């Protein structure tokens, strides 16, 4: 039933693509977006989500060590 | 696959994501608040609100309804029509 | 526009009726119904194997033109198991 | 054969001096005993046909059709209540006795030595089904249905009588061996063309071919289930067996004069598979399905290959079983809802949960699911007609595509997707209808196991 | 084409154009924040001439807005997988058995479920109880000989349930 | 390669027509240049059931490789020397086919341009 | 191919059931570190397509294009295989980026659960298959054809060149 | 007992599924590296592709011209 | 901007660019309001013949029966044999039939003349 509500007035938006797009839209001359509905999508356990080649190169952690083991042994 | 939805929790979720929206206050805002009369926001921003509810819950509402919600309680009533929010 | 008071009132009475309906529709006698009242591997790797291996000796030795092989390949460096003689070995290699 | 005939005569007063609430069990029980008795017929071997003395014989073509007929009778006799189970006792006995007398003339027609005896018992097969479908047709045009029925079948079947008396009084008697063993090839006059046109056109009426196919559909959709299943199965495959008898004579002229009938049969097969893709009135789609398969049969008969005759008899018996079953299913759906149309009573996957399996199995044996007998018949007909001509296989496979299309459209139209939730009267399935289903589809799959029986005399 | 009126209005047409343009621009634009920028641009382009007193100018620019939107739509919009046309279209319709069934069971299975069927008996008595008189009186009472609308007034008079309630109350749960 | 561009742009002569390659008389400037050993044991080539378009040169390496692969079945990776030797022999056969191609190509080029431009 | 895309379909259906059966790539944007078992499985798939040298996807696809290259090609089909290899590379890369490697778009109230022996057993055994079974098949078959094995410069290289570009 | 949801937060994971993910990607990486190291040389065709045949006239059989 | 959407008998005309909705008259408002009144009276009669607990059977729609009686037995009356219907019947009924009959004549003439010459591949052509 309960949820404990991870709650509002916590984000204060600050999330850098939204902050730069508020910069661009304010220099455009609107200054009125929707707002802070997506800060949980842009920061938290997110925000330095990994890039493209890092996902492909996720596997060399045990790989190079085991390869050097197989070469030397 | 369906987490247990109750009435008061989903009411708090709707009012929470309304409260996260900027140009209305958390101060003079309750369940029996209006969208045209006391807050005075337009129909265009009211449909931005309806789009926020649709994009959170994941289903549209028909345009036979689109004019005549105007308060969070009847929003909770229509979502209780959609999901049958009980045990 | 908005809700008419007809829409408000009619929709609220259907709120009361539909919520009482789904309030009923959870069954709970604290008991839903009431009744009126290795060996797998053994059977499925011994019984059809025995039945089919019976079926693939005696009925196949009744019916003549039946299961037939495509021939085991023999080489110059091999012999014949049956009578006992070699095929003479493969000849000279050169220009490797 | 007379031991397979006289208990049907002695089965007639059974229904009369069986009392109330008792006729049903006695008729069903003893007709099933006759089904065992006719299952004991199959003895035929090797060189010759089997003579059942002088009046009678059987080829290995009449034998499976006869066993099919006497198996189909108790199926029908249990099928034909709930629309007359509330009628009178005397009229009920009259109905059941008329069905038994109809069976008697069916067996008389299949077991014939002389073609005159065959013709007398042919229109004796004609006359009771008239009375049955006209009296219990249950729609406002059953009058027109029976009228077109009797007038087409007599007005086509009539010069056959003159031609058969002519063959009687110019070339000795009419034993099938003595119509055989003695027939000289009759050359290409115009009188030979008229006599061939008379005999073949009479049975063309009975098949029907495409030019005379509107004979059928009123006499199915405006007819009860008993006359419908007797009509479709035994009468159409009876006409087919009659042409299989009489086509032994007149071989050097059917090559030159049999081109247009192949033509009308092929183009009508295509257009009939097209016409039963779009119609309402669910009962009629199976009727035009039967017209399509019998046009395929007529192509198979008028080309004269032993492959073609084996495929012909297989297609006959398998389509008789399939069409009789699917008519019984349409009867079950009409007894559920009194509409007879198609788009109205959809749904029926939720409700009637195992009736869907029978719709599926009937539509897949109508689809020619490949171990079944139906694809055996259609396949050997396609083989023989590609040997006949190198370009006709496009029409055959085009029939195949559109046949699959309308059969599976029938399956996913009426019994797929949404109950209209205003029906709110149908009760779940009885044991009687499912018992009729198990009467239908167990012999078809058992013949699919052992199909060396039903292939024809040119085995 | 609506149960309440004959036509919607001009304002509803501009309103639905806003909603459909917003939805199709969701489907067009990924990353959601450049989308938020372009949605504010669309809100500003509607804020260009909100203040028109003319009416033929309003409907003419609405027609031109329809032209511009039809030039800038997307072939597969992000229709939600709950709505018809999307991925649901009553996805779980396999178990939407209506309640005019479930009474055609053998009394052995009805003995297996005693309490639910007794409560169904009291619901059926509640349906039958004031079905005839009050509902026929309210439906023959309120309209003029031309009905002219597709709604119905509630039972505001004294007592029981609002009329014509049964198949709207009784329905599947939409997740069976 | 560029030979394809030369056959699709230049003359059709000096590019030889494909799969009609024996054009000029053999042992032209050879004389007595042939042995053609073929020690691949035709009856044993029948006895080992090979494939068609494999009853050819370098077959004995295939015989020995299939023999050792028959002999060493639990040895999943041992037979590779004879495999590489068969690779080497078909490599040299492709070398011979390339040399025969440019034999016929250069004989066509030099002799036919010589005659047709100094006639 | 059977091993490979059965494993890929199975992992994708796991993702679709994990996000309430919405199934669209929009509103699915980024789900790496939403458990990396399935993202690892999907990248082993969408990288083993076009043949990471030299894996199961190397063997079949590259021997097909090399045998096509040294054959009697119909002068347009070679370019067809080339451009189609480029296109399958680019939609493999795009489906990786739009599924798992972007800004995370999905509705709130996650139910992302894989506490499941069934899922990890099936995905585990088919990634084991997509690592070993291609080499296990390609070793111990009788060679029923002549392998070409003599390819020029810039012809064996151009497959991996086209996939990298 | 099973996993629990959380509203607009990064979800909780176990060490089990992430260590199987890392291990299986690492075994792929080890397999492709040791495979590329042990035998092939799959970028090259294991043999020198020769020149157009040898670029040697008065070999291969020509007349004096 | 856009080529203004030409219609066809397949490409349906959408609700946006009608453009005849925007020519609002009292005639069109009265037509739409009376159309709403017709559908209102039909839905009201349906819901009165739909929601009763004593009504066992089907709803017995006369419009569907009207469509079936128009589609099945109202074909042959009414009819007059005109020039157009006769030409269309003889164009669709005997035309393709004589087409396929001509090509069967052609294929059978070729096969007859070839096997009368005997230059057929019947070294083994058993299953005829």
């Amino acid at each position: 039933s309960k949820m404990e509500l991870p709650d509002y007035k916590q984000w204060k938006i600050e999330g850098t693509p939204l902050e730069t797009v508020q910069e661009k839209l304010a220099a455009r001359g609107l200054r009125d977006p929707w707002g802070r509905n997506e800060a949980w999508r842009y920061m938290g356990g997110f925000a330095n989500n990994v890039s493209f080649v890092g996902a492909l190169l996720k596997g060399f952690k045990w790989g190079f060590a085991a390869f050097v083991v197989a070469v030397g042994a | 696959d369906a987490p247990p939805l109750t009435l008061e929790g989903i009411k708090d979720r709707v009012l929470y994501v309304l409260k996260l929206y900027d140009k209305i206050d958390p101060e003079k805002l309750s369940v029996n608040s209006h969208f045209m009369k006391d807050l005075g926001l337009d129909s265009l921003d009211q449909v931005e609100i309806i789009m926020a509810m649709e994009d959170e819950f994941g289903f549209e509402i028909p345009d036979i309804d689109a004019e005549k919600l105007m308060c969070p309680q009847e929003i909770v009533d229509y979502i209780a029509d959609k999901k049958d929010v009980y045990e | 526009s908005g809700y008419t008071p007809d829409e408000k009132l009619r929709l609220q009475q259907l709120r009361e009726l539909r919520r009482r309906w789904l309030k009923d529709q959870e069954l709970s006698p604290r008991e839903p119904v009431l009744p009126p009242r290795s060996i797998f591997a053994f059977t499925h790797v011994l019984i059809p194997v025995w039945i089919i291996h019976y079926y693939l000796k005696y009925h196949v030795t009744t019916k003549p033109y039946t299961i037939v092989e495509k021939k085991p390949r023999i080489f110059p460096g091999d012999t014949i198991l049956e009578t006992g003689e070699v095929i003479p070995p493969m000849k000279e290699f050169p220009d490797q | 054969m007379l031991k397979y005939i006289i208990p049907t005569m002695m089965l007639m007063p059974l229904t009369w001096l069986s009392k109330n609430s008792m006729i049903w069990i006695n008729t069903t029980l003893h007709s099933l005993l006759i089904s065992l008795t006719s299952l004991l017929l199959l003895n035929q071997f090797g060189d010759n046909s089997l003579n059942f003395s002088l009046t009678f014989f059987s080829d290995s073509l009449s034998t499976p059709l006869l066993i099919l007929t006497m198996w189909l009778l108790p199926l029908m006799l249990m099928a034909s209540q709930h629309h007359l189970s509330k009628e009178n006792l005397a009229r009920k006995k009259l109905f059941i006795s008329m069905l038994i007398l109809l069976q008697l003339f069916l067996i008389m027609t299949f077991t014939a030595t002389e073609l005159i005896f065959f013709y007398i018992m042919f229109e004796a097969t004609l006359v009771p089904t008239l009375i049955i479908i006209t009296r219990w047709g249950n729609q406002t045009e059953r009058l027109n249905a029976g009228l077109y029925f009797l007038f087409y079948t007599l007005a086509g079947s009539l010069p056959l009588l003159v031609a058969l008396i002519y063959i009687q009084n110019t070339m000795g008697s009419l034993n099938f061996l003595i119509l055989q063993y003695w027939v000289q090839p009759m050359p290409n006059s115009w009188s030979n063309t008229f006599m061939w046109l008379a005999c073949m056109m009479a049975f063309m009426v009975k098949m029907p071919l495409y030019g005379l196919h509107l004979w059928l559909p009123k006499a199915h959709v405006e007819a009860p289930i008993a006359g419908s299943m007797v009509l479709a199965a035994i009468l159409l495959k009876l006409g087919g067996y009659g042409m299989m008898r009489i086509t032994l004579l007149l071989n050097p002229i059917t090559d030159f004069m049999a081109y247009p009938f192949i033509m009308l049969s092929l183009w009508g097969m295509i257009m009939t598979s097209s016409i039963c893709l779009r119609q309402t009135d669910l009962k009629s789609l199976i009727a035009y399905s039967s017209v399509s398969h019998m046009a395929l049969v007529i192509v198979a008969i008028l080309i004269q290959t032993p492959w073609s005759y084996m495929g012909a008899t297989a297609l006959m018996i398998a389509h008789g079983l399939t069409s009789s079953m699917l008519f019984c299913l349409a009867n079950s759906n009409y007894e559920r809802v009194h509409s007879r149309t198609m788009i109205l009573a959809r749904g029926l996957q939720t409700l009637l949960p195992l009736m869907a399996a029978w719709w599926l199995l009937a539509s897949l044996t109508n689809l020619a699911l490949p171990p079944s007998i139906n694809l055996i018949g259609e396949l050997f007909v396609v083989m023989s007609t590609f040997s006949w001509s190198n370009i006709t296989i496009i029409l055959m496979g085009l029939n195949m595509v559109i046949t699959a299309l309308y059969s599976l459209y029938m399956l996913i139209t009426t019994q797929r997707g949404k109950h209209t939730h205003h029906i709110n009267n149908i009760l779940p399935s009885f044991t009687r209808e499912n018992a009729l289903m198990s009467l239908h589809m167990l012999p078809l799959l058992l013949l699919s196991l052992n199909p060396k029986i039903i292939l024809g005399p040119l085995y | 084409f609506l149960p309440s009126a004959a036509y919607l209005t001009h304002q509803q047409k501009v309103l639905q154009l806003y909603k459909r343009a917003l939805r199709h621009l969701e489907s067009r634009c990924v990353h959601r924040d450049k989308y938020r920028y372009f949605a504010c641009l669309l809100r500003a382009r509607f804020d260009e001439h909100k203040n028109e007193k003319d009416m033929v100018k309003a409907t003419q620019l609405l027609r031109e807005a329809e032209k511009e939107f039809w030039h800038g739509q997307h072939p597969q919009p992000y229709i939600f997988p709950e709505s018809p046309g999307g991925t649901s279209y009553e996805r779980y319709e396999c178990y939407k058995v209506p309640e005019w069934c479930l009474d055609d069971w053998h009394p052995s299975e009805k003995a297996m479920y005693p309490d639910y069927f007794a409560k169904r008996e009291q619901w059926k008595k509640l349906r039958r109880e004031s079905w005839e008189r009050e509902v026929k009186q309210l439906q023959e009472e309120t309209p003029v000989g031309g009905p002219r609308t597709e709604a119905l007034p509630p039972a505001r008079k004294q007592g029981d349930l609002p009329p014509l309630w049964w198949h709207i109350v009784t329905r599947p749960r939409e997740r069976p | 390669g560029a030979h394809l561009a030369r056959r699709y742009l230049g003359d059709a002569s000096v590019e030889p027509e494909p799969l009609r390659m024996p054009t000029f008389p053999p042992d032209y400037g050879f004389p007595e240049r042939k042995e053609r050993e073929m020690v691949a044991t035709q009856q044993e080539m029948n006895d080992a059931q090979l494939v068609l378009q494999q009853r050819d040169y370098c077959a004995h390496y295939l015989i020995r490789f299939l023999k050792c692969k028959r002999d060493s079945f639990p040895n999943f990776l041992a037979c590779k020397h004879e495999q590489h030797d068969w690779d080497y022999c078909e490599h040299l056969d492709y070398v011979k086919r390339m040399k025969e191609f440019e034999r016929e190509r250069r004989l066509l080029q030099r002799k036919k341009r010589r005659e047709q431009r100094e006639a | 191919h059977a091993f490979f895309k059965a494993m890929l379909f199975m992992c994708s259906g796991s993702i679709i059931h994990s996000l309430n059966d919405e199934q669209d790539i929009r509103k699915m944007g980024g789900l790496f570190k939403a458990m990396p078992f399935t993202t690892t499985a999907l990248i082993i798939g969408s990288l083993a397509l076009t043949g990471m040298p030299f894996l199961t996807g190397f063997y079949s696809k590259d021997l097909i294009i090399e045998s096509a290259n040294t054959s009697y090609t119909n002068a347009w089909a070679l370019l067809m295989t080339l451009v189609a290899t480029s296109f399958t590379a680019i939609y493999s890369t795009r489906i990786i980026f739009f599924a798992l490697l972007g800004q995370p778009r999905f509705p709130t109230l996650i139910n992302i659960n894989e506490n499941n022996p069934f899922l990890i057993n099936s995905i585990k055994r088919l990634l084991i298959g997509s690592l070993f079974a291609g080499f296990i098949i390609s070793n111990n078959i009788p060679p029923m054809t002549i392998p070409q094995m003599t390819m020029p410069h810039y012809l064996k290289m151009t497959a991996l060149t086209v996939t990298i570009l | 007992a099973h996993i629990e949801p959380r509203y607009r937060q990064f979800p909780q994971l176990t060490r089990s599924q992430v260590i199987q993910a890392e291990f299986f990607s690492a075994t792929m990486w080890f397999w492709i590296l040791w495979r590329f190291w042990h035998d092939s040389d799959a970028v090259l065709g294991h043999f020198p592709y020769p020149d157009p045949s040898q670029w040697t006239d008065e070999e291969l059989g020509i007349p004096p011209d | 901007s856009f080529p203004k959407y030409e219609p066809s008998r397949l490409a349906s005309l959408p609700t946006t660019l009608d453009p005849a909705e925007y020519d609002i008259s009292s005639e069109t408002r009265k037509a739409q309001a009376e159309r709403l009144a017709i559908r209102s009276r039909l839905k009201r009669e349906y819901q009165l013949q739909y929601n009763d607990p004593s009504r066992r059977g089907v709803v017995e729609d006369p419009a569907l029966i009207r469509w079936t009686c128009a589609r099945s037995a109202n074909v042959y009356p009414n009819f007059r044999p005109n020039t157009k219907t006769s030409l269309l019947g003889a164009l669709f009924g005997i035309g393709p039939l004589i087409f396929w009959y001509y090509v069967f004549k052609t294929d059978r003439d070729r096969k007859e003349k070839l096997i009368q010459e005997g230059k057929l591949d019947r070294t083994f052509n058993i299953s005829y």
Side-chain angles (χ1 to χ4, degrees), chain I residues 17-38:
Chain I
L17 61 158
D18 292 331
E21 186 182 3
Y22 294 155
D23 294 332
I24 291 98
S25 177
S26 178
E27 297 173 352
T28 60
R29 298 303 194 196
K30 188 181 288 184
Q32 291 175 356
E34 288 177 353
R35 185 179 296 113
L36 191 275
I38 295 301

Side-chain angles (χ1 to χ4, degrees), chain C residues 4 13 36 50 56 59 80 85-86 90:
Chain C
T4 66
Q13 280 110 28
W50 284 346
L56 291 179
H59 296 87
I80 295 171
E85 72 267 14
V86 298
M90 192 272 291

Side-chain angles (χ1 to χ4, degrees), chain A residues 2-72:
Chain A
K2 69 177 74 66
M3 198 65 204
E4 292 182 356
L5 289 176
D7 53 355
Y8 65 98
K9 64 186 181 294
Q10 183 182 1
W11 304 107
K12 193 178 179 180
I13 178 71
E14 200 266 330
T16 55
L18 286 174
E19 187 173 0
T20 56
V21 79
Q22 286 179 355
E23 287 175 352
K24 290 183 180 180
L25 187 142
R28 179 67 181 272
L30 276 73
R31 297 180 182 180
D32 49 359
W34 179 263
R36 297 175 293 170
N37 209 167
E38 297 168 357
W40 64 276
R41 290 178 179 174
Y42 282 167
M43 66 183 179
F46 299 149
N48 207 166
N49 193 2
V50 74
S51 178
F52 178 74
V53 298
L56 280 77
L57 298 177
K58 189 260 288 180
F60 71 99
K61 293 186 286 186
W62 187 65
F64 282 162
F67 181 74
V68 171
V69 165
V71 167

Side-chain angles (χ1 to χ4, degrees), chain A residues 40-42 46, chain E residues 26 29-33, chain G residues 19 22 24-31 97-99 102-107:
Chain A
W40 64 276
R41 290 178 179 174
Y42 282 167
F46 299 149
Chain E
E26 286 181 353
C29 188
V30 298
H31 296 171
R32 181 71 69 191
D33 53 359
Chain G
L19 203 136
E22 294 185 353
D24 294 331
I25 282 299
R26 281 87 54 85
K27 202 173 183 181
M28 194 67 75
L31 288 176
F97 179 73
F98 283 162
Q103 296 296 321
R105 69 191 73 90
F106 55 92

Side-chain angles (χ1 to χ4, degrees), chain D residues 6-73:
Chain D
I6 202 66
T8 303
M9 283 82 162
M10 297 302 290
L11 199 147
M12 185 179 289
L14 176 77
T15 313
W16 293 104
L17 44 84
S18 296
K19 65 182 73 65
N20 195 0
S21 69
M22 197 176 177
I23 47 96
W24 184 261
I25 313 298
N26 303 321
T27 49
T28 303
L29 174 63
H30 292 174
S31 186
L32 288 167
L33 291 174
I34 298 303
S35 295
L36 279 89
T37 302
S38 299
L39 188 143
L40 194 142
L41 190 150
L42 197 147
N43 204 176
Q44 188 169 359
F45 60 96
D47 52 355
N48 55 3
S49 67
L50 197 282
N51 288 329
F52 274 149
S53 297
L54 188 144
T55 312
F56 290 146
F57 76 102
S58 178
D59 291 329
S60 64
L61 189 62
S62 66
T63 295
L65 292 172
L66 183 145
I67 298 169
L68 180 63
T69 300
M70 305 199 201
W71 175 254
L72 189 67
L73 186 74

